[PDB]
Amino acid sequence: MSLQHEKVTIAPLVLLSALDHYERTQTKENKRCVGVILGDANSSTIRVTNSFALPFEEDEKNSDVWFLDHNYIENMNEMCKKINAKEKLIGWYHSGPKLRAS
């Protein structure tokens, strides 16, 4: 872990995919797309190379009830590294449409 990250610069492609992904999974409010975020970090400049969708189901009756496909993530991480090695897990996007405490 490091807290040394003073800026994040994000490619047009990362924005465009995550946004694009929201209607490709055909989710509407109060259902969430989340995806894996791939890119560079450990540096001040964060450089956000790419992103790919995960399935994500949110139950908000209990914010302790959640769906996350675990296995999917590990599999996908390894394939991306063979195209380009600079892709690491640097986070995950939440589709909004606001911040939560959750």
Partner: protein
């Protein structure tokens, strides 16, 4: 026949244009590649929704670089998220040539025709584009038997078509042999824009 036959107008969505370029520019001067997800409607209207890249197990644009497991594994993943749709072509890069398929890449396109009837091979130029706009052209390969007995003109009518002469003479021979080329258009959502 089964259809009158004419070459596809490719409505390449924003995310797919932008993605092929990212991957292929990074890949200079190697050949780069991957598969196209889309849907085929109308007599010529192919909408390409997304692309995904095929991990290099070869030099790129080989059948050593197309892995059966990989193909299987990616498809199996796309179902969970609903991005599973049928393969409408494959992309590749020449960054040493214009839009014009080389002999090895024809051999790759000959194998794709077995997979899909309407598969395209799309040449992406990452640095070598000669206009302000990105030069990309899509090709389809149909047999020599229809083309020689003079069925090539019929196939190319009732559409605006595209003519390019980027490698001049070399292109014309190749163009002829493969099939044809057709205007490439871009699908923009006003959210995306």
């Amino acid at each position: 026949t089964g259809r009158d036959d004419t070459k596809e107008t490719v409505y390449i969505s924003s995310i797919a244009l932008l993605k092929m370029l990212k991957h292929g520019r990074a890949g200079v001067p190697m050949e780069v590649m991957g598969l196209m997800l889309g849907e085929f409607v109308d007599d010529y209207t192919v909408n390409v929704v997304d692309v995904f890249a095929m991990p290099q197990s070869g030099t790129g644009v080989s059948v050593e670089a197309v892995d059966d497991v990989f193909q299987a594994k990616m498809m199996d993943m796309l179902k969970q998220t609903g991005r599973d749709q049928m393969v409408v072509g494959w992309y590749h890069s020449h960054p040493g040539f214009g839009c014009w398929l080389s002999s090895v890449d024809v051999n790759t396109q000959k194998s794709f025709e077995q997979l899909n009837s309407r598969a395209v091979a799309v040449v992406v130029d990452p640095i070598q584009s000669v206009k302000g706009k990105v030069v990309i052209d899509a090709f389809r390969l149909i047999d020599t038997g229809a083309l020689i007995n003079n069925l090539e003109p019929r196939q190319t009518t009732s559409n605006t078509g595209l003519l390019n002469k980027a490698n001049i003479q070399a292109l014309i021979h190749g163009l002829n042999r493969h099939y044809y080329s057709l205007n490439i258009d871009y699908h923009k959502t006003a959210k995306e824009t």
